[PDB]
Amino acid sequence: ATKSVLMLGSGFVTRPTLDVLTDSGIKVTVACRTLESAKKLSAGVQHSTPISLDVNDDAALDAEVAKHDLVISLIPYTFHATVIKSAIRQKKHVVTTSYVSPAMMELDQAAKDAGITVMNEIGLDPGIDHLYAIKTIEEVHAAGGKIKTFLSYCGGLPAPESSDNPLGYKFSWSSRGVLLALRNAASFYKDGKVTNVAGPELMATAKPYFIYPGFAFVAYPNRDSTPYKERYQIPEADNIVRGTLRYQGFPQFIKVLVDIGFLSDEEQPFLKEAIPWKEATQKIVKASSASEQDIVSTIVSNATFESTEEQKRIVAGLKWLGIFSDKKITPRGNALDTLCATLEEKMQFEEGERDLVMLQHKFEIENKDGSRETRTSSLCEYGAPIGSGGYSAMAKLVGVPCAVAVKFVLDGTISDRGVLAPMNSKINDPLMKELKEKYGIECKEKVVA
Amino acid sequence: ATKSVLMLGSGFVTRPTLDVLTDSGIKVTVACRTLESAKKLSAGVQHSTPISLDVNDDAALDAEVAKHDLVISLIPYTFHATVIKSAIRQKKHVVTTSYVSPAMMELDQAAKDAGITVMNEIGLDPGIDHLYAIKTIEEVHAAGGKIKTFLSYCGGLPAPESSDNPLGYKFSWSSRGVLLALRNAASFYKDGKVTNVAGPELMATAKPYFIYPGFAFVAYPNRDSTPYKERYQIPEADNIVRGTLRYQGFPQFIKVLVDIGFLSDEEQPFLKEAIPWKEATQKIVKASSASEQDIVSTIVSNATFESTEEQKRIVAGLKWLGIFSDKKITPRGNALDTLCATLEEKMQFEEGERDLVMLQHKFEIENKDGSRETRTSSLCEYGAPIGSGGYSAMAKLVGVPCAVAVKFVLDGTISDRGVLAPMNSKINDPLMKELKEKYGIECKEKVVA
Ligand SMILES: NC(=O)C1=CN([C@@H]2O[C@H](COP(=O)(O)OP(=O)(O)OC[C@H]3O[C@@H](n4cnc5c(N)ncnc54)[C@H](OP(=O)(O)O)[C@@H]3O)[C@@H](O)[C@H]2O)C=CC1
Ligand SMILES: NC(=O)C1=CN([C@@H]2O[C@H](COP(=O)(O)OP(=O)(O)OC[C@H]3O[C@@H](n4cnc5c(N)ncnc54)[C@H](OP(=O)(O)O)[C@@H]3O)[C@@H](O)[C@H]2O)C=CC1
Ligand SMILES: N[C@@H](CCCCN[C@@H](CCC(=O)O)C(=O)O)C(=O)O
Ligand SMILES: N[C@@H](CCCCN[C@@H](CCC(=O)O)C(=O)O)C(=O)O
């Protein structure tokens, strides 16, 4: 029985998924709104078919979904609920590398009634991080140990040698997704109590986070970690934090953008016209003139800087992006998306450059015999150089786990119905085994103290 | 006329030199005290012959030197004068990748009278750094520009992903050489005036040095840079500094070892006996007991720490080295060498790991038209993974330049007699050309401001 999969999306993390599936003899229809993008991804790939499809078209989506055994939603997570509803009425399975949101979880019973499996959070973060966090936690518990502290930090960044731009950041996955993640309020456990961080004040929490001597990482909380007390079954943990890693200087730069209104997704009439960046910025920052001096004067009066050195650096970075120039904007209605169009222009990985994925779990453990130790679980991988034809570390670590999950749902290895995530050794072990043995993907443990 | 070369040494940087020369049809005799070491390096290498030879034996040295056209001194630099005296008697050329010291310079006229060329400072640093520092300086001057500031920083370190040990450092070249360099007094130009740093206080001058967002580099002055005002012909420079790069935390750790006397090369009777580290450390630090508590007590009272966190870190690192344990020391007479034996034991690169060479020149320029700009010349290279059979970045960037120089002295490309260094475009250009076009070795320029 030849299997067939509908892959929604042809972006950053899709090629590895397409490769793994077609290399298994599974037919894959690659679908997104821009036919050309779908063709480019599937060009030369055996068993693949490119088509144009907008998930907003219910009739069109249902007709295509009905032609396959399962749908992979590798598109903006805002669309997952819609995709699941289509899969439910067509009785087809679903796989995503996104968080299970309340909207998605609401469809759990309906999914079960339709007898379908909606497997989520099986990319890098969320995904691989869950697999190895749970692996260690269950091991410790089985040994009568206690997890007093659970930390999990991850960052998809450019390799240090390829990080030379004002932001120390280049895109390896959804550009707008990156900006959206920069506004997420966070919550976590510290010294046994819940600590909250409001979205608009996320960057200010950034602190240097030491992993290895050679890296200059800074970190900030990632979304709400408190539910993991129950999700990972670690009620004894006083500290529980899932965080994000960036390079020195990044958060301060973002903070300024947030403070002057550049991460606002509020529709502005003036942002639908291709006006010069000078003017767009003037309106966004609310400066009295499109002059660089006036714009900067307003920005400095409304932003925070750790020092005059920082201020000089960030302002020069903003200028580098071209927001003070005559170059016309790519009108996208709101500041966030309009800025995003220019970021996509200037922060792309170039020939010969590579990305880097750093993922590290840290466990403060209290052994059964009252003894204490510190354990780390790490994954540090560089992507293949641009122009080599190889995968970036991000695409590999997201797309491969995704493909493995798809194959498991198709062959019944993952058989629970409803809206799921990698939260049971029943499916986590098989996932880890395949990723390790067949692809060399794994987190390595080590006792640090 | 088949050329023959006597390569003294078979350590870290020799394999690339041996490979390049023998691949050129040049016969090479690999010589050092330990016959097995010479054999291991030349095993399977065409045109190579391994022998045991101690440069301290004048008669044996002259006899061997006389059989070749040129001698490469890839051994501790304390031996260069001795090697050159032998080369002078035998009228043979010499090449080293070491600094021209006063002792070596004293032999300049005798070398000239013997008609031989003694080419030095043609490794990575000193070496490649000289080549590209001069290249840019002469370009700017030819354009009527002024070099107001000249900075040159270089570090041979483990790649960030391979830097996971208490020191953030692993050996890629002479272990004791590394330690010796940590005690060198420094001097440089700052704001038009000479600034001196005493050897014992070198580590305290370390400051974060920004190059790329991803790296966490710290830097300190490297030896006396003041002579370069004349050496590089930049009398108009207000700031002139040649420095070294290490990773965050390294200098503070070394500072402690220096303060408690671990970098002393004073012969101690008790350090000639394979006693437990506990005891050795006790005597060296002068603690009232071999107890971990007493030793640490003495250390904390005699060392400096930026914070209690730092103190905890460094003490844990020292314990990691095992100087508080029962393990017997490898008796080497003095603290520096005795400690070195243990460092060599614990700080070696392991399977799959790799080093990193970061070299960057920075020039603050004042153009002819009064305009100003900042230029950087960079080289950032990772070494082949251990076990791959490839060269480390250090071995490649030291050994290849050395081999090219040897070939140039042999065919006459470098013909000036006496004690030399890469200080003239006459020989620097050919050196850079060959290294760039044949091996892809070069520093890339860029205007930063
Ligand atoms: N778990 C993890 O660790 C990670 C998860 N992800 C998740 O993976 C998903 C995809 O990420 P990534 O590949 O980087 O995304 P990209 O932004 O690169 O690509 C998104 C793709 O979705 C398509 N798309 C957008 N809107 C529609 C629509 N209305 N109908 C059909 N297709 C549409 C695009 O279509 P079009 O061609 O028409 O523009 C495009 O091909 C996201 O949900 C992201 O958050 C990403 C990285 C890591
Ligand atoms: N310019 C640059 O950028 C760099 C320059 N260097 C310089 O290169 C030289 C070699 O460095 P590296 O390869 O790392 O050194 P290692 O410490 O790895 O090896 C030194 C070698 O010299 C040999 N040796 C020591 N004493 C004697 C002796 N009495 N007679 C004969 N041989 C002896 C050793 O001999 P044995 O087998 O008997 O023990 C060993 O093979 C040094 O002077 C170093 O400072 C190094 C790195 C970079
Ligand atoms: N947290 C790291 C790793 C990137 C993981 C990206 N995953 C997306 C998932 C969004 C979704 O589809 O639900 C994210 O925003 O965390 C970093 O930011 O560098
Ligand atoms: N300065 C860098 C690069 C190491 C180059 C080592 N060269 C030796 C040369 C000694 C000699 O033979 O004269 C040095 O000590 O700088 C670093 O320290 O990491």
Give the β-pairing of A93-95 and A117-119.
Answer: parallel
Handedness of CA B406, B409, B410, B411 (dihedral sign): positive
What is the distance between the alpha carbons of residues A320 and A167, in angstroms, rounded to a whole number?
10
In this structure, the answer to whether residues B224 and B355 fall within a common structural domain is yes
Tell me which DSSP letter residue B166 carries. T
Neighbours of B139 (CB within 10 A): 12
User: How many distinct structural domains can be found in chain A?
Assistant: 3
The C-alpha of A32 sits at a distance from chain B's nearest C-alpha, in angstroms, of 34
Q: Considering every ligand atom, which ligand is closest to the CA of A17?
A: 1
End-to-end CA distance of chain A: 52
The technique by which this structure was obtained is X-ray
Q: Tell which residue, B11, B53, B13, B57, has the closest CA to residue B29.
A: B53
In this structure, the answer to whether residues A274 and A237 fall within a common structural domain is no
Contact between A195 and A225 (Cβ < 8 Å)? no
- Considering only the beta carbons, identify the residue of A158, A164, A214 that sits closest to B157: A214
Secondary structure of residue A5 in the 3-state scheme: strand
**Burial letters for B422-443: b for 16+ Cβ neighbours within 10 Å, e otherwise?**
bbeeebbeebbebbeeebebbb
Listed residues A318, A348, A378: the one ending a domain: A348
User: CA-CA distances (angstroms) from residue A364 to A138, A229, A367?
Assistant: 14, 15, 10
User: CA-CA distances (angstroms) from residue A419 to A113, A230, A265, A338, A347?
Assistant: 12, 17, 29, 34, 35
Please tell me if the CB atom of residue B103 comes closer than 6 angstroms to any atom of ligand 4: no
Contact between A218 and A153 (Cβ < 8 Å)? no
Q: Tell which residue, B255, B256, B153, has the closest CA to residue B211.
A: B153
The C-alpha of B199 sits at a distance from chain A's nearest C-alpha, in angstroms, of 24
| Both tokens assigned to A316 | 């020069």
Contact between A116 and A108 (Cβ < 8 Å)? no
Q: Resolution of the coordinates in A?
A: 2.1
In this structure, the answer to whether residues B221 and B360 fall within a common structural domain is yes
Handedness of CA A152, A158, A164, A166 (dihedral sign): negative
Q: Does an H or E element contain B205, and which?
A: none
The alpha carbon of A331 and the centre of ligand 1 are apart by a number of angstroms equal to 21
Secondary structure of residue B37 in the 3-state scheme: helix
In this structure, the answer to whether residues B71 and B45 fall within a common structural domain is yes
Full 3-state SS string of B45-73: CCCEEEEECCCCCHHHHHHHHCCCCEEEE
- What residues are paired with A156 via a beta bridge? A357
What is the distance between the alpha carbons of residues B226 and A107, in angstroms, rounded to a whole number?
73
Contact between A214 and B163 (Cβ < 8 Å)? yes
Tell me which DSSP letter residue B376 carries. E
* Residue A353: partners with Cβ closer than 8 Å, 6 or more residues away: A158, A159, A162, A170, A385, A386
In this structure, the answer to whether residues A239 and A267 fall within a common structural domain is no
B213 interaction partners in chain A (CB closer than 8 Å): 160, 163-164, 167-168, 216, 247-250
Rounded to 5°, the CA angle B167-B173-B359 comes to 80
Q: Based on C-alpha coordinates, what's the Rg of chain B?
A: 23
In this structure, the answer to whether residues B9 and B77 fall within a common structural domain is yes
CATH number for the domain including A194?
A: 3.30.360.10
Please tell me if the CB atom of residue B172 comes closer than 6 angstroms to any atom of ligand 2: no
* Residue B95: partners with Cβ closer than 8 Å, 6 or more residues away: B70, B71, B72, B73, B118, B119, B120, B122, B402, B405, B406, B409
* Separation of CA A53 from chain center: 23
- Considering only the beta carbons, identify the residue of B213, B216, B247 that sits closest to A163: B213
Q: Tell which residue, B242, B223, B221, B226, has the closest CA to residue B189.
A: B226
User: CA-CA distances (angstroms) from residue B139 to A402, B142, B248?
Assistant: 54, 5, 35
How many residues are present in chain B? 449
* Residue A115: partners with Cβ closer than 8 Å, 6 or more residues away: A91, A417
* Residue A187: partners with Cβ closer than 8 Å, 6 or more residues away: A194, A195, A196, A197, A221, A223, A224, A225, A226
What is the distance between the alpha carbons of residues B62 and B41, in angstroms, rounded to a whole number?
23
Q: Considering every ligand atom, which ligand is closest to the CA of B82?
A: 2
In this structure, the answer to whether residues B87 and B9 fall within a common structural domain is yes
Q: Tell which residue, B73, B21, B112, has the closest CA to residue B420.
A: B112
Please tell me if the CB atom of residue A154 comes closer than 6 angstroms to any atom of ligand 3: yes
| Residue ranges making up the domain that contains B192 | 124-248+349-393+442-448
* Residue B126: partners with Cβ closer than 8 Å, 6 or more residues away: B97, B98, B99, B120, B421
Residues of A with CB under 8 A from a CB of B: 157-164, 167-168, 212-216, 247-250, 356, 380, 382, 449
| Both tokens assigned to B1 | 């006329």
Neighbours of B313 (CB within 10 A): 18
In this structure, the answer to whether residues B242 and B304 fall within a common structural domain is no
Give the β-pairing of B48-52 and B27-32.
Answer: parallel
In this structure, the answer to whether residues B283 and B255 fall within a common structural domain is yes
In this structure, the answer to whether residues A234 and A383 fall within a common structural domain is yes
What is the distance between the alpha carbons of residues A305 and A133, in angstroms, rounded to a whole number?
36
In this structure, the answer to whether residues A12 and A159 fall within a common structural domain is no
Neighbours of A37 (CB within 10 A): 18
Please tell me if the CB atom of residue B12 comes closer than 6 angstroms to any atom of ligand 2: yes
In this structure, the answer to whether residues B13 and B102 fall within a common structural domain is yes
Please tell me if the CB atom of residue A56 comes closer than 6 angstroms to any atom of ligand 1: yes
The alpha carbon of A175 and the centre of ligand 3 are apart by a number of angstroms equal to 11
Phi then psi for B404, rounded to 5 degrees?
-60, -45
* Ligand 1, atom nearest to A127 Cα: 1
- Considering only the beta carbons, identify the residue of A168, A213, A380 that sits closest to B214: A168
A343, HSE (Cβ side, Cα atoms, 13 Å): 27
What is the distance between the alpha carbons of residues B296 and B279, in angstroms, rounded to a whole number?
13
Q: Could you tell me which chain A residue has the CA closest to the CA of B168?
A: A213
CATH number for the domain including A294?
A: 1.10.1870.10
Whether A71 has a binding-site annotation, put simply, is no
Rounded to 5°, the CA angle B401-B404-B405 comes to 85
DSSP secondary structure, A216-275, as one string: -EEEEE-SB-TTHHHHTT-TT-SEEEEEEEEETTHHHHHHHHHHTTTT-----GGGGS--
What is the distance between the alpha carbons of residues A430 and A383, in angstroms, rounded to a whole number?
25
Listed residues B320, B348, B376: the one ending a domain: B348
**Longest Cα separation, chain B:** 69
The C-alpha of A212 sits at a distance from chain B's nearest C-alpha, in angstroms, of 5
Q: Based on C-alpha coordinates, what's the Rg of chain A?
A: 23
CATH number for the domain including B109?
A: 3.40.50.720
The alpha carbon of B99 and the centre of ligand 2 are apart by a number of angstroms equal to 14
Q: Does an H or E element contain B262, and which?
A: none
Secondary structure of residue B32 in the 3-state scheme: strand
* Residue A14: partners with Cβ closer than 8 Å, 6 or more residues away: A7, A30, A41, A74, A395, A399
| Both tokens assigned to B356 | 């990193």
End-to-end CA distance of chain B: 52
Secondary structure of residue B296 in the 3-state scheme: helix
- What residues are paired with A32 via a beta bridge? A52
DSSP secondary structure, B185-202, as one string: -EEEEETTEEEEE-GGGS
